[PDB]
Design a protein around this ligand. Sequence first.
Ligand SMILES: Nc1ncnc2c1ncn2[C@@H]1O[C@H](COP(=O)(O)OC(=O)CCCC[C@@H]2SC[C@@H]3NC(=O)N[C@@H]32)[C@@H](O)[C@H]1O
Ligand SMILES: Nc1ncnc2c1ncn2[C@@H]1O[C@H](COP(=O)(O)OC(=O)CCCC[C@@H]2SC[C@@H]3NC(=O)N[C@@H]32)[C@@H](O)[C@H]1O
Lengths: 322, 322
Amino acid sequence: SKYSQDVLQLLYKNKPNYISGQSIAESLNISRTAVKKVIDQLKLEGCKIDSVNHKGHLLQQLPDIWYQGIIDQYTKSSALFDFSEVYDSIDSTQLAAKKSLVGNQSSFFILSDEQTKGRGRFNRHWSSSKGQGLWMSVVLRPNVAFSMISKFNLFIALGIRDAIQHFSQDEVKVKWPNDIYIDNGKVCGFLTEMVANNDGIEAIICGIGINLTQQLENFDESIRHRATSIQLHDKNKLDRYQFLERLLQEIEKRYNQFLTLPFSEIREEYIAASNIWNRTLLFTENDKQFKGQAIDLDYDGYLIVRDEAGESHRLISADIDF
Amino acid sequence: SKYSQDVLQLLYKNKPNYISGQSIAESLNISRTAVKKVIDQLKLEGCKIDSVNHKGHLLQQLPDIWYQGIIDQYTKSSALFDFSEVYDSIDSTQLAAKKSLVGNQSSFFILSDEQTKGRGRFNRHWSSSKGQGLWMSVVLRPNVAFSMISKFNLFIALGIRDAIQHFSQDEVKVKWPNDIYIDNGKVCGFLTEMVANNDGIEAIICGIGINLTQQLENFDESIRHRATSIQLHDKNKLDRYQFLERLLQEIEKRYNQFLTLPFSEIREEYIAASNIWNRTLLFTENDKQFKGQAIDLDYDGYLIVRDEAGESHRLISADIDF
Ligand SMILES: Nc1ncnc2c1ncn2[C@@H]1O[C@H](COP(=O)(O)OC(=O)CCCC[C@@H]2SC[C@@H]3NC(=O)N[C@@H]32)[C@@H](O)[C@H]1O
Ligand SMILES: Nc1ncnc2c1ncn2[C@@H]1O[C@H](COP(=O)(O)OC(=O)CCCC[C@@H]2SC[C@@H]3NC(=O)N[C@@H]32)[C@@H](O)[C@H]1O
């Protein structure tokens, strides 16, 4: 219905209290039976709504679906984001964000339940199943030189890792520059992009894909031995709204640090959060492949690497395989 | 008409020969009187078309209007550009290009007769009068690191300056990093932007605005003492199609050099093409202003400056006033 999101937003706003169907009807200026039909439909999609005679309706639990009405409350109370766009299915939130940022200076995020053309680094396929992960692009407006893109990427990683760690009983680690792991399984990839010129960044677009509720059978093919979801490491049901709220909080925290601190302030905590040390790594550089060991992360965020031939490299980015 | 661009493209294709109305009618599968009406309308907009009984029509001259039908011939025979978009009026070709490049790897350009929201560096107003200049954005796909943006900007300047110089009896000079001058008048501003991440450039967007046919009375306000058009320096009528063709050629030439040569190969020719030397310059850095002298352009394209206090600076970009 036209009014399903409005009814949902009133339910959400009123937690922990019940609201009457009559009160929702007066807010939206619709009949009481139209309100009943909307609530019957929301319950059908998987909202747990407790309805008690003479008292009204309490939203108790939301399904694994993004609702614009609820996300609207997340943005209303945000000091970072002006708005959000929520979709059931789209080609890519990253493409959507790149189009939406043009001609304005808004900060915003895009969420979609599904992507049909999700891409990672190097334009690799990113699997984005309906109702099973968080597929998001975040647009921000830092007043910084374009070379700061690498620094951003280091701060945001810790914010993502912290959010995931809150829901996982297992050790969550960063794999520089762009992956989050739990044990031997990738739970998240994120991709930082920019629109920039010589005078500065016009926008940062951070694409973030986090596996939330896949069982291993849901991972399909042979990323399976290499992939994991938060639910596989959580004894409790993972609630996507609880998670999103925690994630938005850590992103804002880490984004304020990016704006105000040198990377050297964060560098030790980043080292201790990393799973790249004391192991042989496979680097790919265009058509070249070589093995090496990561020996340090310098004060400017460059990986210091000693290859199998004994030669040192100082790398702003790489693609690393375990 | 639906067919005006098609008729125009056939006329253009057939130069220097006349084509009959009957032959245009058979190509487009329309009546002979529909062809006559299209030609009558094109003549009304300012096309000079010579019509002779029994023989047909020759396009002799186009007006100061961009026609998609003609621009289509420029792209068909291009080794650089896959397509173009031509508009009579748009907010900005730069905004249009930023939207159009998303989700593809095409190389292309956008032209508009007018812009209602033309912007330069720092989001300054760029005046874009209907029928008086070339207002263009070019999208290219160099396979390079994001830090190469500054180098691109140095090569393209010489290509623009060369094209303008061909139509001007006066000395055309580059004002680093982003302006082209004839004497004391700015004839052109260009703006290089990119979409990039740590793995490379996804697109370069070069916004190029060249004043073609303004009289001084057309410049309005008090940019007048500081602004000029190519026509004010040309004894001949300036033909925008001739100019565009020359400009596209020099851009491709200079873009191939960017891909294959170090800036040190071009550096002396850039110095000799510049009007910034042996004069006091005003620099603006955020809220700071200072005077200085440009003393050299280094091998990486950095301006070397000695300020009024005697201190040296090495600058990748600046905003300079005379
Ligand atoms: N759902 C998944 N979970 C764990 N691994 C996956 C996966 N789908 C694909 N993979 C594997 O991990 C690699 C991903 O490549 P990279 O390391 O280049 O690239 C990345 O790690 C980052 C992906 C960013 C995805 C988000 S989803 C929201 C936004 N919209 C987009 O379209 N993109 C962003 C693949 O080559 C696969 O082996
Ligand atoms: N038509 C004009 N001719 C000469 N000067 C002008 C002018 N309009 C404005 N100006 C002056 O020059 C300055 C322009 O600022 P900058 O130096 O920051 O910035 C530039 O020099 C570059 C402009 C790029 C314009 C093109 S037109 C096609 C494409 N689409 C766009 O929207 N933009 C690009 C202004 O502050 C004015 O003083």
